[PDB]
Write a protein that binds this ligand. Structure first.
Ligand SMILES: [Ca+2]
Ligand SMILES: [Zn+2]
Length: 223
């Protein structure tokens, strides 16, 4: 997260760190056995780390569970990043408490202007790479589709939305990928892509979760 702030330990109880010997992507806990992340975060050997704040120190509250299966959306296109969503089933269910809680899926999409909370342990430099030890947060608004499409002509599909600041200086970045964009307590987006990080007129693009709720429900129901 570039230009964000330190969230505070366990103040984002649904945030998970996907780990394969290091933190490589974020994710959101939606029930005790499933996590939603981005399809471009897929790889094998994923350990899901819950209740984290400092990812390099065991402080207490952490639960490390292996992923039993990862389901990348069948229509995921890695060149356009359309349908950039993935579901991860945990080998065992997590013990939910106040430090580890799930987030609700939306019932309707969010409007432009809605303020959301984005978090993660991704890069904090637009120019350079610095990865934090503790979770960073950023409050950002969903932009209008015209501003989004004008920023990325021909690359925005109906399954994407832009959120952020056109003046630059504040955005999600590499590492935050797969993590949550929560608006009014509902998971509305997944950190997906953008040109660089925090560059002027290049807001972050997110997967539009409201378009995948039936898919998520049917898939979880059959697995
Ligand atoms: Ca830790
Ligand atoms: Zn990414």
């Amino acid at each position: 997260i570039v230009g964000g702030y330190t969230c505070g330990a366990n103040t984002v109880p649904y945030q998970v760190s996907l780990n394969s010997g290091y933190h490589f992507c974020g994710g959101s806990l939606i029930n005790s056995q499933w996590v939603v992340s981005a399809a471009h975060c897929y790889k094998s050997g994923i350990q899901v780390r819950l209740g984290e704040d400092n990812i390099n120190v065991v402080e207490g509250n952490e639960q490390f569970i292996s992923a039993s299966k990862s389901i990348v959306h069948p229509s995921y296109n890695s060149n356009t990043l359309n349908n950039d969503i993935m579901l991860i089933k945990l080998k065992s269910a997590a013990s939910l408490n106040s430090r580890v809680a799930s987030i609700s899926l939306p019932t309707s999409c969010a409007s432009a202007g809605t303020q959301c909370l984005i978090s993660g342990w991704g890069n904090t430099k637009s120019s350079g790479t610095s990865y934090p030890d503790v979770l960073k947060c950023l409050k950002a608004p969903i932009l209008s589709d015209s501003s989004c499409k004008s920023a990325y002509p021909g690359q925005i599909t109906s399954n994407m939305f832009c959120a952020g600041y056109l003046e630059g200086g504040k955005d999600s970045c590499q590492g935050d990928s797969g993590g949550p964009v929560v608006c009014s307590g509902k998971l509305q987006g997944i950190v997906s892509w953008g040109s660089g990080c925090a560059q002027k007129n290049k807001p972050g693009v997110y997967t539009k979760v409201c378009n995948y709720v039936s898919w998520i429900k049917q898939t979880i129901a059959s697995n």
